[PDB]
Amino acid sequence: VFAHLQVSDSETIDLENLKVYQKVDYSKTAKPLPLYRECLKPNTEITFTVS
RNA sequence: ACGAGAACAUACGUUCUUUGAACCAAGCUUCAACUCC
């Protein structure tokens, strides 16, 4: 079933939609962890072509 | 004082002419740059 799913990449997202976040863990109460990862800012549209 | 004596089975002559080791065939199939604290 996965040999017949054709998914491509996306078009090149503009570089202004990237934002560096703090990785926070929330088990009982939120506390930060020293790890920043460069994510996308929310409500950002990314376009794929899947067949 | 031998059915004997003398006498090269020798001379000449391209294993040679024509002939694709070719034809067909995806280096591909399945994978999250990821999990934990």
Radius of gyration, CA atoms only, chain A = 16
**Size (chain A), residues:** 51
CA angle A7, A9, A13 (to 5 degrees): 145
- Residue located via tokens 């072509």: A49
Give A23's contacts (C-beta < 8 A, 6+ positions apart).
A32, A33, A35, A36, A37
Pick out the nucleotide with least CA–C1' distance to A25. B37
From the CA of A45, how many Å to the C1' of B5? 126
Helices within chain A (DSSP H only): none
- Proximity of residue A30 CB to strand B below 7 A: no
A12-18 long-range Cβ contacts below 8 angstroms, 24+ apart: A13/A40, A13/A44, A13/A46, A17/A41, A17/A44
